Amino acid sequence: RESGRKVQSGNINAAKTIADIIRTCLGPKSMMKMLLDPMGGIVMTNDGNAILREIQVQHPAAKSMIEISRTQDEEVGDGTTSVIILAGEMLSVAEHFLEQQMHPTVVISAYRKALDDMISTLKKISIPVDISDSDMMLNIINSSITTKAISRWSSLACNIALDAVKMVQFEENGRKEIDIKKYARVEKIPGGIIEDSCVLRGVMINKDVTHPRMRRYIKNPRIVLLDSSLEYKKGESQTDIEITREEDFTRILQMEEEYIQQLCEDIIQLKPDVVITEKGISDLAQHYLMRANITAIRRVRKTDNNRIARACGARIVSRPEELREDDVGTGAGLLEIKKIGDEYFTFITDCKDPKACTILLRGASKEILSEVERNLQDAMQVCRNVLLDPQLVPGGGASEMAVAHALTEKSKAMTGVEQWPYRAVAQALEVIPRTLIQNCGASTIRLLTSLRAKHTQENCETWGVNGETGTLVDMKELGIWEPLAVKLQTYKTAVETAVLLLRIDDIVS
Amino acid sequence: MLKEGAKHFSGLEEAVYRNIQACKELAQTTRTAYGPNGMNKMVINHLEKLFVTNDAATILRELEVQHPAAKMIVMASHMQEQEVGDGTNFVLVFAGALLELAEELLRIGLSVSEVIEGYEIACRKAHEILPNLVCCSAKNLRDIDEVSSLLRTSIMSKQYGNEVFLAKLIAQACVSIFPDSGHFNVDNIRVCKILGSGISSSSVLHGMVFKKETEGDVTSVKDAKIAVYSCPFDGMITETKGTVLIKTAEELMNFSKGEENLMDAQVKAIADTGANVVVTGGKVADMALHYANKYNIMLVRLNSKWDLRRLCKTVGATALPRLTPPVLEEMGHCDSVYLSEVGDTQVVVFKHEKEDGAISTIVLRGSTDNLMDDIERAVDDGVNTFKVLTRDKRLVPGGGATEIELAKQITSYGETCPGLEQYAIKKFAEAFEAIPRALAENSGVKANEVISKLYAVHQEGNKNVGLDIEAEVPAVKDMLEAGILDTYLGKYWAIKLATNAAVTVLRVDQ
Amino acid sequence: VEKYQQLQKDLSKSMSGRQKLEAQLTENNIVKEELALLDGSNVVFKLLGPVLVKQELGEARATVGKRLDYITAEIKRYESQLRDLERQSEQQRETLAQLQQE
Amino acid sequence: EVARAQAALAVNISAARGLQDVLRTNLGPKGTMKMLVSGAGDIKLTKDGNVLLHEMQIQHPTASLIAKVATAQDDITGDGTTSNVLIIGELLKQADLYISEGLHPRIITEGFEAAKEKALQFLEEVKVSREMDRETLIDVARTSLRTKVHAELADVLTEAVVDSILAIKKQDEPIDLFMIEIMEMKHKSETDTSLIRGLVLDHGARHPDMKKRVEDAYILTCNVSLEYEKTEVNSGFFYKSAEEREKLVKAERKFIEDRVKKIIELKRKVCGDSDKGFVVINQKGIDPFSLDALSKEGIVALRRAKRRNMERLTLACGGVALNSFDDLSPDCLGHAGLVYEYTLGEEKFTFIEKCNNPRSVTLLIKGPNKHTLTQIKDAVRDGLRAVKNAIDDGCVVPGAGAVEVAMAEALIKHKPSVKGRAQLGVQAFADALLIIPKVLAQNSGFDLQETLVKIQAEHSESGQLVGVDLNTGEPMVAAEVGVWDNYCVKKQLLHSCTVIATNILLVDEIMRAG
């Protein structure tokens, strides 16, 4: 059992010492971390996550940081290295003052009073980017993919993420879910090269395809999703006794067949040729599809069919007894099973649903494939971020010292108790300048002043320091940009954790 | 090292000091072990079995050391005792004193590559006068006195007292029948000792002695084809299992009854295979005997491998365990196959003899085998120096008497050539007096006494010492003119091999 | 190796008709039924020995109760020789396997 | 616990000196060999930087780190491994000296980058084309072996070195992946390296009078069994029951006896003439009466070869991997202009030679049959790895640290960045350059500086590359000396030098983790 001011200070220590070493690993300029093990394992990384794994945590605050670290990692997977740097500051700042000024509560509400002023400042500093201009996305992407320092064949395929993710942008939920990444489903091609790696519509189906199970090439004929509920009914809607002896083999397995033949027709009625049936298939369901010489592809996975439900963008059948071409095999559709390098690759394309597009990934090896995809993974995440909020924000301390004033201006305004948490929280913003002044290897205290001097008039609008340029700079002149999406997320993320650990004074066995 | 890593055995002390330790440390007993000596150095095994060697190897190969250089240089002493013979102790004892010179050149601080060459050019400079120090050669193997002299310095520089008598024996071993024209049998002539009689009764026999006991009626002919088998009769007990153990418990018993008919048909097949001597590493038994008495084949009751292998080797035989009647892939190589009682003990005597391919098997006798085993060591000294394969061996004075010849010059040549180089050349020629000093201090007199006289006698080839009273005061024995000489070859490899490792081992910081 | 297979026949020996019992065991429940189902409507016979023994319900009532119990009894005699034979052939398996490999 | 701030650095760079130290002469004609009874515990003998690394058990993480990146350049170079280790620590100190002065390692790392490129930029300036001829092949092969072994053993091998590489230029192959077929002979003498423009096998199998001298070489290299297991097997090893293992073997010798008769006409189809020599090579054993009756056909036959051999003989002899003893085409079965089964020591070594492809070419080293024989082997292979770079690039440059000063003369004087912040790293960068020539010379002779100023002044005079004379410890122009780096090696080194010295300079911590 661990409790009390210890855990309070422990809420500081863990998130602190976590965040401490990691800001050096932040930034395109970043100071790497060595690891050694008693096992001998050596790790050279600027990657907090990878670090966050092999490191050990004997404090649950240090453990729950990994949790909230994976939160942003669940979300994106970058900025996780960043999020931890925020709360680790906060508790290391407000608390020892304000918990010895006695409260869990004040900064908690002030964490929100911090959370909003960012959003406030965000409505200024973050300025819209259009997905119509690729570079206007891609310059962020070029900045985002060079974060992991491969600009080589990642960048041109990041257009594919700039396309596929943007082109799997769909499903307005009425507050408009459309902004997204995940619907983009990567293709895996042995052979080819990221040059000839380029989107096909819907979802290009690699996963269950090592070989054609769906014709060879199908253009008009409908790729059709049959989804469970193809199992027989020996009665009208019912199932009676099954095959036992002579005429039950006939009668019963016939009783099984009619209901399915009845199910079969509705598929053939919409004119398929290929039919992808996920689990819940009858051999009864296929053989009349065979009687129409319309291939029924059985026992194949769900996401794959959801890929295929995203590939021609048809739906998944919710009433397989009454079927529509509007249900499955929508539009004209396409199905093309292509050998590129080793493997036949089903391409179900000409997608209805708002387009849809998946990243064609062709490496010569799978390595030269993988190097691209990993940085591609930045774009497709930044793409969804540009899809989420398409407001590109100046990087560096541009947002930091901005909100800091606006928070301390909110301190000047509100002049309450939480003014002090602001001046405690507004102090957290300076990380990026300090991080960057570290990573450039300059003197912060002048640049701290000079950035406050950048805020004194400019309000640090586009002006932070960029350690990568090493100087206090407009981020328009450096073209440094991020969506308001990624900012507030990472911003809000540790704020929540800054609430989280501060909530916890007690561990009990 | 400075770090968690780098497992390293040498460097700093280790390189500088601790290598030189095992250098001088092992070079200790070889100071007593080469040149005329009786020196008793008592070596027992992991068997803790009493022995004394005057040759370094039995001390060396006995020992255990974590120093690879000290563990290496013996291979040069090997390469000596491999190519050559007595003078193997000389290998180690030379370098160690020579090596200290380099560390004192490191006490001077002299550079490795700079000290490296000083020993080397001087070596070829020693190898320059080394043939210039060829005085005589070994004129005739056919001359006992040439070979006795050849064996003399050989046995002497291990054992000085037993020297000439043995030197006359193994010279009259007539291994001269091997022209040394590029053929000499070293093993086919090997000593077979007789525990018992005297070591003066120790003599040479011609044809292979086998001290092991004849069984069966002795060979039906002589030139008798030789069945050499690991266990032709071990009894009829089973040879047949992969692990040579029991499969089921009923097999061992049938070997008593059909033993007769087997030990009949088996040695009958030995009579049928043409072998009038079957060699049984397994036990002789009466039925075999009784039938080998009917078939008049000599059984060789039990065998060392040294018996077997030599018979596997010399006869061309293959020793195999037999139960079933066997056959000869073996036959004989031997044109006379004897039971003779030599040392008074029944001795299987195989004989085939040629100018190339003879077996002249020296029969040592004596009250103790711990005598003859070191005697054989002292004896094998000359058995080696027989094989030079220049009949005229370009003898240079043995006993290190021709050292000061080189020693004075190369070190005078030392200052001739310049620099940090010249010291290692000078140091090179300073390591000569070691062996005489080592020897003269086996007789208990310092070098400077002795060597300043060897410096006073100047160019002789004659003066050296180390077991005698003339060893003590005069610093004059003839290790040239008294019948002590040594071939260029051995003396070459004496310098050559003592040249090689000493330099090469100097590199290692690990 | 024969050691693997050695005691399994002696094993299944006592198991053989024990299995036959367990159908009779099931039909012993049925003969209890078909005795209770027979009030004497048609004759009840324990058939034991080549002689047909005229029999009665109460004569066969304990009996079929005794049979079913006994038809459970040849179970335990195998349960005796069950772990006799399977266990010692379990040791034998390694005995002559390696010796023959040896 | 952890090691942070300076502690994440010092222990790394402090380890990087004694490491650097011991092998400071592993290198150049001044180079000195080392052994190990320690790291792997055995009796071992080695000279090279990366190679002495792996042999030890190195528990300090950094000691294992360079071994990786060094191995990359170690591959093609084979020398300069020991070298690149030396300049990095020579670099690390200056950067440490800055952080000792105090400064930021990443702006210091930032200080390497122009200087590295500037030096790289200088590296094409200083690369001087000596195209491939035996002279450049000699002088690079020796300076590599002068590094790796005796200049004696260098020039002893420098013949054997250029021997094979003549036919690899017949291949026009800038690298040698064959002719690197090496045979290590049982002998007393190390120095004897025999060029065989074909291969060598230790075989000729168990039988003589097979016409072990084959002038018309027709080679069947096969894995077919003319001999095989007598061991008890059922499933492939000893089966629980004994007897079922038995039924297999009685088809062995019969299969072998039959293939003898198959080779008869395989001699008659192929040749029909003992005057046309036929060679069998078995990857497995061969029974005596096979070879014996194969000796009756005018055939030498080699049991138990190796996969390289089979392929190399399939290559060099234009030979075969063919699987059969049945009648086969002679044109399939490869050819060598001469074949002989040679004996030095116990084993009879077949010298197969003048082979259809002079492709896999034996350089046959004799030797003491030791770690020494193992020692003399590894170097000449790297002596090639030197000259392949000389074959690789057209630019072969004076060695013995000739390039180093001119860079420090090039780089520092004008600030290559014209900027101190980088010049910091540059001043650190251009000091790394000088250690190897100045450490070896001062090891081999006169000091770093008083020798430097001589190499400096003559560079300062000419800018021409005056190297070091390691025969003294003084500078000379390493053009005439013959010690010649290629552009490749020196190109490769800064890459392997800098990128490893940078990321480790930027370690912000080190932690035992899990």
Q: Are B148 and B163 in contact (CB under 8 A)?
A: no
From the DSSP assignment, how many helices (H) and strands (E) are in chain D? 17, 18
Q: For residues A89 and A65, give the distance between their C-alpha atoms in angstroms, rounded to a whole number.
A: 13
Residue-wise DSSP of D468-506: EETTTTEEE-HHHH--EEEHHHHHHHHHHHHHHHHHTTT
Q: Are D5 and A34 in contact (CB under 8 A)?
A: no
How far lies A163's CA from each of A45, A288, B333, D405, in Å?
31, 40, 91, 53
Q: Are B408 and B458 in contact (CB under 8 A)?
A: yes
Q: Which of B5, B83, B509 sits opposite D56 (nearest CB)?
A: B5
For the record, the structure tokens of D459 come out as 């560079």
Residue-wise DSSP of D352-398: EEEESS--S-EEEE---SSHHHHHHHHHHHHHHHHHHHHHH-SBEEE
Is D348 marked within a binding site?
A: no
* Type of residue found at B388: V
Which residues have CB under 8 Å from A415's CB, separation 6+? Answer: none
CA–CA min distance D456, chain B (Å)? 24
> Closest by alpha carbon to B189, among B346, B371, B329, B313?
B313
DSSP state of D282: E
For residue D48, indicate whether it is catalytic. Answer: yes
Is B139 marked within a binding site?
A: no
Note the Cα D355 to chain centre separation in Å.
24
Q: Which of D64, D104, D106 sits opposite A42 (nearest CB)?
A: D64
* Type of residue found at B409: Q
Which residues have CB under 8 Å from A37's CB, separation 6+? Answer: A54, D512, D513, D514
Cβ <8 Å between D508 and A56: no
Q: For residues D396 and D387, give the distance between their C-alpha atoms in angstroms, rounded to a whole number.
A: 9
Which residues have CB under 8 Å from D7's CB, separation 6+? Answer: none
Q: Are D377 and D444 in contact (CB under 8 A)?
A: no
The answer to whether B245 contacts chain C (CB < 8 Å) is yes
In 10 A of CB B238, how many CB atoms?
Answer: 17
Which residues have CB under 8 Å from D345's CB, separation 6+? Answer: D185, D186, D187
Length of chain D: 514
Helix (H, G, I), strand (E, B) or coil at A296: strand
Identify all chain B residues contacting C100, using CB atoms and an 8 Å cutoff: 247
The answer to whether D239 contacts chain C (CB < 8 Å) is yes
> How many A×D Cβ pairs under 8 Å?
75
Identify all chain B residues contacting D36, using CB atoms and an 8 Å cutoff: 7-9, 510
Note the Cα D484 to chain centre separation in Å.
18
Q: For residues A168 and D240, give the distance between their C-alpha atoms in angstroms, rounded to a whole number.
A: 63
Cβ <8 Å between C1 and D241: yes
β B463-464/B477-478 pair status: antiparallel
Helices (H), B315-352: none
The secondary structure element, H or E, covering residue D36 is strand D34-36
* Type of residue found at C5: Q
Is A78 marked within a binding site?
A: yes
> Closest by alpha carbon to D273, among D252, D249, D248, D299?
D299
β A189-190/A362-363 pair status: parallel
Which residues have CB under 8 Å from D414's CB, separation 6+? Answer: none
CA–CA min distance D131, chain B (Å)? 32
Identify all chain C residues contacting B245, using CB atoms and an 8 Å cutoff: 102
For the record, the structure tokens of D12 come out as 């790394």
The secondary structure element, H or E, covering residue B232 is none
- Rg (chain A; Cα; Å): 28
Q: Assign 3-state DSSP to chain B and report helix, strand, coil percentages, each to 5.
A: 45, 10, 45
Residue-wise DSSP of A39-52: T---EEES-HHHHH
Q: Are B163 and B156 in contact (CB under 8 A)?
A: yes
> Closest by alpha carbon to A69, among A411, A490, A358, A503?
A490
β D193-196/D396-398 pair status: unpaired
Query: Assign residue D470 a region: left if phi > 0, alpha if psi is -120 to 50, beta otherwise?
Result: alpha
Q: For residues D139 and B181, give the distance between their C-alpha atoms in angstroms, rounded to a whole number.
A: 43
Identify all chain B residues contacting D400, using CB atoms and an 8 Å cutoff: none
Helix (H, G, I), strand (E, B) or coil at B73: helix
Note the Cα D376 to chain centre separation in Å.
11
Identify all chain C residues contacting B247, using CB atoms and an 8 Å cutoff: 99-100, 102
Query: Assign residue D209 a region: left if phi > 0, alpha if psi is -120 to 50, beta otherwise?
Result: left
Nearest CA in chain C to D245: C101
Cβ <8 Å between D106 and A34: no
Q: Are B169 and B203 in contact (CB under 8 A)?
A: yes
Q: For residues A274 and A297, give the distance between their C-alpha atoms in angstroms, rounded to a whole number.
A: 7
Identify all chain C residues contacting B249, using CB atoms and an 8 Å cutoff: none
Cβ <8 Å between D239 and C102: no
Q: Are B495 and B130 in contact (CB under 8 A)?
A: yes
* Type of residue found at D197: R
Q: For residues D25 and D436, give the distance between their C-alpha atoms in angstroms, rounded to a whole number.
A: 9
> Closest by alpha carbon to B375, among B52, B46, B20, B23?
B52
DSSP state of D127: -
| b/e B441-474 (16+ beta carbons within 10 angstroms → b) | bbbebebeebbebbeebeebbbbbbbbeebbbeb
Q: Are B446 and B439 in contact (CB under 8 A)?
A: no
Is A148 marked within a binding site?
A: yes
Is A325 marked within a binding site?
A: no
Q: Are B25 and B39 in contact (CB under 8 A)?
A: no
From the DSSP assignment, how many helices (H) and strands (E) are in chain C? 4, 0
In 10 A of CB D189, how many CB atoms?
Answer: 10
CA–CA min distance C16, chain D (Å)? 28
Q: For residues A184 and A163, give the distance between their C-alpha atoms in angstroms, rounded to a whole number.
A: 9
E-strand ranges in B271-425 read 275-280, 298-300, 336-342, 345-351, 363-366, 395-396
Q: For residues A114 and D130, give the distance between their C-alpha atoms in angstroms, rounded to a whole number.
A: 69
Q: What are the catalytic residues of A?
A: 47, 80-81, 378
The answer to whether D5 contacts chain A (CB < 8 Å) is no
Cβ <8 Å between D238 and C101: yes
> How many C×D Cβ pairs under 8 Å?
17
Q: For residues B323 and B236, give the distance between their C-alpha atoms in angstroms, rounded to a whole number.
A: 5
Interface of A with D (CB under 8 A): 21, 24-25, 29, 31-44, 54-56, 438-442, 470
**Burial of A193 by CB count in 10 Å (0-12 exposed, 13-18 middle, 19+ buried)?**
middle
Cβ <8 Å between C102 and D238: yes
Helix (H, G, I), strand (E, B) or coil at B189: coil
Q: Which of D61, D110, D509 sits opposite A441 (nearest CB)?
A: D110
Among the options D62, D77, D81, D136, which is catalytic?
Answer: D81
Q: How was this structure determined?
A: cryo-EM
CA–CA min distance D59, chain A (Å)? 7
How far lies D153's CA from each of A359, D143, D149, in Å?
59, 11, 6
Half-sphere exposure of residue D440, counting CA atoms within 13 Å on the CB side?
30
For the record, the structure tokens of D350 come out as 């077949």
Neighbours of chain C (3+ CB pairs under 8 A): B, D
Q: What is the dihedral of CA A416, A420, A422, A428, to 10 degrees?
A: 180
Helix (H, G, I), strand (E, B) or coil at B225: strand
β D396-398/D484-486 pair status: antiparallel
For the record, the structure tokens of A52 come out as 């966050």
For the record, the structure tokens of B456 come out as 């006073």
| b/e D343-353 (16+ beta carbons within 10 angstroms → b) | eeeeebbbbbb
Is A147 marked within a binding site?
A: yes
Identify all chain C residues contacting B241, using CB atoms and an 8 Å cutoff: 102
CA–CA min distance B247, chain C (Å)? 6
For the record, the structure tokens of A13 come out as 């220590």
For the record, the structure tokens of D220 come out as 């069947």
Residue-wise DSSP of B1-62: --SS----S-STHIIIIIHHHHHHHHHHHHHHHSSS-----B---TT----B-SSHHHHHTT
| b/e B41-78 (16+ beta carbons within 10 angstroms → b) | bebeeeeeeebbbbbbbbbbeebeeebbbbbbbbbbbb
Q: For residues D301 and A154, give the distance between their C-alpha atoms in angstroms, rounded to a whole number.
A: 58
The answer to whether B45 contacts chain C (CB < 8 Å) is no
Note the Cα A42 to chain centre separation in Å.
29
Touch of C by A (3+ CB pairs closer than 8 Å): no
3-state secondary structure A198-242: CCEECEEECCCCCCCCCCCEECCCECCEECCCCCCCCCCCCCCCC
In 10 A of CB A128, how many CB atoms?
Answer: 12
Q: What is the resolution of this structure in A?
A: 8.5
Note the Cα B355 to chain centre separation in Å.
23
The Cα diameter of chain A in Å comes to 95
E-strand ranges in B216-291 read 225-229, 275-280
CA terminus-to-terminus distance, chain A? 5
Which residues have CB under 8 Å from B423's CB, separation 6+? Answer: B105, B108, B110, B115, B118, B414
Is B303 marked within a binding site?
A: no
* Type of residue found at B32: T
Is B158 marked within a binding site?
A: yes
For the record, the structure tokens of B107 come out as 């006490």
Q: For residues A444 and A449, give the distance between their C-alpha atoms in angstroms, rounded to a whole number.
A: 8
Identify all chain C residues contacting D237, using CB atoms and an 8 Å cutoff: 101
For the record, the structure tokens of A90 come out as 């906060």
Q: Are B403 and B433 in contact (CB under 8 A)?
A: yes
> Closest by alpha carbon to B317, among B274, B356, B262?
B274
> Closest by alpha carbon to B211, among B290, B303, B85, B127?
B303
Q: For residues A198 and A192, give the distance between their C-alpha atoms in angstroms, rounded to a whole number.
A: 11
Residue-wise DSSP of B443-502: TT--HHHHHHHHHHS-S-S-EE-SSSHHHHTT--EESSTTS--EEHHHHHHHHHHHHHHH
In 10 A of CB C84, how many CB atoms?
Answer: 15
Cβ <8 Å between B241 and C99: no
Q: Are A311 and A351 in contact (CB under 8 A)?
A: yes
Q: For residues D352 and D349, give the distance between their C-alpha atoms in angstroms, rounded to a whole number.
A: 9
In 10 A of CB B195, how many CB atoms?
Answer: 16
Note the Cα A429 to chain centre separation in Å.
25
Q: For residues B294 and B268, give the distance between their C-alpha atoms in angstroms, rounded to a whole number.
A: 9
Is A487 marked within a binding site?
A: yes
> Closest by alpha carbon to B180, among B489, B497, B491?
B489
Identify all chain D residues contacting B509, using CB atoms and an 8 Å cutoff: 22, 32, 34
- Rg (chain B; Cα; Å): 27
Q: Are B201 and B366 in contact (CB under 8 A)?
A: yes
Q: For residues D56 and D63, give the distance between their C-alpha atoms in angstroms, rounded to a whole number.
A: 10
Q: For residues A487 and A479, give the distance between their C-alpha atoms in angstroms, rounded to a whole number.
A: 16
Q: For residues D372 and B79, give the distance between their C-alpha atoms in angstroms, rounded to a whole number.
A: 14
> Closest by alpha carbon to D206, among D346, D359, D110?
D346
> Closest by alpha carbon to D365, among D375, D356, D355?
D375
β A274-277/A225-226 pair status: parallel
Q: Are B503 and B113 in contact (CB under 8 A)?
A: no
Identify all chain A residues contacting D65, using CB atoms and an 8 Å cutoff: 42
> Closest by alpha carbon to D135, among D164, D157, D158, D152?
D158
Nearest CA in chain D to C93: D240
> Closest by alpha carbon to B61, among B80, B40, B86, B78?
B78
Q: For residues D443 and D445, give the distance between their C-alpha atoms in angstroms, rounded to a whole number.
A: 6
For chain B positions 223-242, those within 8 Å of chain C (CB to CB) are 241-242
Q: For residues B450 and B434, give the distance between their C-alpha atoms in angstroms, rounded to a whole number.
A: 11
Which of D238, D241, D243 has the highest number of chain C CBs within 10 A, making it the mutation to test binding with C? D241
> Closest by alpha carbon to D404, among D434, D427, D432?
D434
Cβ <8 Å between D239 and C4: no
CA–CA min distance C12, chain B (Å)? 28
Q: For residues A172 and D156, give the distance between their C-alpha atoms in angstroms, rounded to a whole number.
A: 80
> Closest by alpha carbon to B278, among B206, B239, B230?
B230
How far lies A488's CA from each of A90, A483, B300, D155, in Å?
16, 9, 100, 71
Q: Are A78 and A490 in contact (CB under 8 A)?
A: no
Q: Which of D105, D108, D512 sits opposite A38 (nearest CB)?
A: D512
Nearest CA in chain D to C94: D240
Is A471 marked within a binding site?
A: no
